[PDB]
Amino acid sequence: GKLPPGPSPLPVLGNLLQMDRKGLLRSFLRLREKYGDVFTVYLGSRPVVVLCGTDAIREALVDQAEAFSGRGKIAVVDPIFQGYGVIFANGERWRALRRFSLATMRDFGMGKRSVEERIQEEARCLVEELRKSKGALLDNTLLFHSITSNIICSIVFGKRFDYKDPVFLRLLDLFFQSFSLISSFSSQVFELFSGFLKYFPGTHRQIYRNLQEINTFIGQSVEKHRATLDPSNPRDFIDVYLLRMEKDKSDPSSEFHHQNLILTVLSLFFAGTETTSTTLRYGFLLMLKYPHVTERVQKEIEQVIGSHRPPALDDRAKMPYTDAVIHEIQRLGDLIPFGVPHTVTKDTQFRGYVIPKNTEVFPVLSSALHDPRYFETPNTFNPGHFLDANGALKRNEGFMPFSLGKRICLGEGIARTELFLFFTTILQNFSIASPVPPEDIDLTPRESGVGNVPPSYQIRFLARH
Numbered sequence: 222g223k224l225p226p227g228p229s230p231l232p233v234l235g236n237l238l239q240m241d242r243k244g245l246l247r248s249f250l251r252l253r254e255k256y257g258d259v260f261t262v263y264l265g266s267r268p269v270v271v272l273c274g275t276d277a278i279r280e281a282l283v284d285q286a287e288a289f290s291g292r293g294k295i296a297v298v299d300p301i302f303q304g305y306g307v308i309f310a311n312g313e314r315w316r317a318l319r320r321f322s323l324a325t326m327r328d329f330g331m332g333k334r335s336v337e338e339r340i341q342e343e344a345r346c347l348v349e350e351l352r353k354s355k356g357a358l359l360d361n362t363l364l365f366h367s368i369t370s371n372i373i374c375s376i377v378f379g380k381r382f383d384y385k386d387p388v389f390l391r392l393l394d395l396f397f398q399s400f401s402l403i404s405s406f407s408s409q410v411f412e413l414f415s416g417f418l419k420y421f422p423g424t425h426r427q428i429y430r431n432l433q434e435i436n437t438f439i440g441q442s443v444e445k446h447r448a449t450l451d452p453s454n455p456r457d458f459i460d461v462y463l464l465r466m467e468k469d470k471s472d473p474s475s476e477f478h479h480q481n482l483i484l485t486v487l488s489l490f491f492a493g494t495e496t497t498s499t500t501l502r503y504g505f506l507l508m509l510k511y512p513h514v515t516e517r518v519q520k521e522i523e524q525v526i527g528s529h530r531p532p533a534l535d536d537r538a539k540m541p542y543t544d545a546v547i548h549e550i551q552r553l554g555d556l557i558p559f560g561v562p563h564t565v566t567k568d569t570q571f572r573g574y575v576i577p578k579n580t581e582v583f584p585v586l587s588s589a590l591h592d593p594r595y596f597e598t599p600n601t602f603n604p605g606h607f608l609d610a611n612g613a614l615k616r617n618e619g620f621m622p623f624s625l626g627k628r629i630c631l632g633e634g635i636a637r638t639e640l641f642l643f644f645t646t647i648l649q650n651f652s653i654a655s656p657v658p659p660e661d662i663d664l665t666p667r668e669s670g671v672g673n674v675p676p677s678y679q680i681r682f683l684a685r686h
């Protein structure tokens with residue numbers, strides 16, 4: 222019962238504790254080189270198994286899906302962490318989230334328009350909004366944040382907001398705008414001894430100002446909903462949930478309920494949506510750099526959709542190249558380098574070694590996204606990574622931006638639809654330009670850490686007509 226090959230732990234300080242993305246990337250390439258695709262690294266009295274590349278990951282997530290279906294444990298004591306962390310600490314709860322979203326999506330087509338439809342509409346308002354700029358230089362960051370969020374809003378709150386609407390413009394900041402944290406060793410030391418640091422450790426100071434403001438909007442939205450709830454005609458996710466806890470009314474569990482709800486929506490709302498908004502953004506940075514490929518995309522749109530018909534989810538199958546560009550964008554955007562960690566639910570043999578129950582495993586997705594065994598030019602934008610001999614779309618075995626297995630992204634589908642419609646629509650209507658020349662656009666992600674996010678950039682949308 223030996224774990225896989227690995228380096229030597231350093232006691233309670235950290236052999237490699239505190240390294241930065243670049244330093245670790247260097248360390249990671251070495252470890253993988255020293256031990257292979259499956260190695261063990263030791264941290265704070267615990268071993269985490271690291272899976273590298275297409276094969277190792279697939280052997281784990283897919284060939285032994287259940288064994289690896291455990292989600293990384295989260296152990297801390299706080300107020301905020303306790304109440305919420307618990308709600309989703311269990312693996313069963315995660316399943317419950319899926320089980321509800323799929324069934325609800327199936328049985329309750331809520332509001333005279335399907336998902337693909339609400340996205341075709343949002344794109345339509347985007348094209349309407351993009352003209353209101355009249356060819357100026359703006360930052361897609363907020364726009365792309367708006368459109369992708371509106372979708373989650375529609376499906377959950379039963380409506381979409383207008384890009385200028387304050388209730389929306391402000392909610393967008395609550396979730397997506399970054400807050401700088403200012404501290405100094407001096408101040409930190411003072412806080413620790415007399416700081417009541419146990420009370421506002423790290424980021425709590427900031428979150429609570431958003432958390433309270435958010436818990437408010439939801440809380441009051443749930444309320445406006447519950448009062449107009451036609452039990453024969455639900456309108457959105459919230460109604461369909463209200464109808465469920467109408468039995469549990471006359472109990473104080475409602476406070477527990479409402480809280481259950483808030484995170485689910487935020488977790489659903491921000492992590493998926495933010496990732497999608499970033500993917501789009503990154504997508505257009507690429508589009509600027511490689512104008513050649515941007516043209517083909519446009520030319521193809523023209524041969525299948527034309528200049529007037531709004532693009533639909535059915536064109537994706539008749540547009541192999543544009544679909545290939547979107548795969549590449551996801552492969553290179555690579556927003557989740559290490560990927561959410563797993564925990565193996567039982568004593569699991571793996572390539573001969575033995576990973577004990579609850580041994581946290583890291584499926585490094587980036588190592589697959591860039592896996593040389595599966596991509597001709599692993600670090601170069603190349604739509605050919607996904608096109609067969611006859612210019613048709615072949616699947617690449619190493620393409621897993623949404624991870625794999627039982628634990629795959631609950632929004633993988635809804636996301637890819639957003640990506641294709643938003644992309645083809647924008648490009649069917651507008652032409653893109655930037656101050657920077659393509660050959661000087663740097664794609665290198667600003668990498669504060671824990672995720673790839675592209676550098677800021679201006680962009681110009683020109684209506685072809």
Ligand code: HEM
Nearest residue numbers: 315489493494496497557561622623624628630631632636
């Ligand atoms: C757009 C690009 C997106 C990417 C690259 C992405 C990626 C991922 C990854 C890597 C995971 C976890 C993988 C694992 O547990 O092994 C995940 C899980 C999840 N994602 Fe996303 N996601 C995206 C969009 C979205 C969207 C739009 C939503 C909307 C709700 C969403 C909601 C979720 C949820 C609910 C899970 C839970 C996984 C589980 O059930 O255990 N994601 N996603």
Ligand SMILES: OC[C@H]1O[C@H](O[C@H]2[C@H](O)[C@@H](O)[C@H](OCCCCCC3CCCCC3)O[C@@H]2CO)[C@H](O)[C@@H](O)[C@@H]1O
Nearest residue numbers: 319322323324326327336373376489631632633634635
């Ligand atoms: O058995 C095959 C059937 O299922 C597919 O439709 C699924 C699709 O998988 C898909 O359209 C959807 O699954 C999505 C489940 C998770 C919800 C996605 C997001 C919705 C918004 C909030 C966040 C989650 O549910 C549909 C109905 O269950 C096929 O596309 C259908 O044509 C077919 O009837």
Ligand SMILES: OC[C@H]1O[C@@](CO)(O[C@H]2O[C@H](CO)[C@@H](O)[C@H](O)[C@H]2O)[C@@H](O)[C@@H]1O
Nearest residue numbers: 537538544548614615616617623633634
């Ligand atoms: O995330 C995997 C998921 O996407 C789908 C979409 O059909 O995979 C297929 O479709 C893609 C988009 O065009 C291609 O990569 C390819 O045609 C195919 O693998 C799902 O079937 C799958 O579960």
Ligand SMILES: *C(=O)Cc1ccc(C(C)(C)C)cc1
Nearest residue numbers: 488491492493495496497561
């Ligand atoms: C974008 O998808 C970032 C992201 C990935 C995964 C998650 C979960 C798995 C829900 C914590 C959040 C945000």
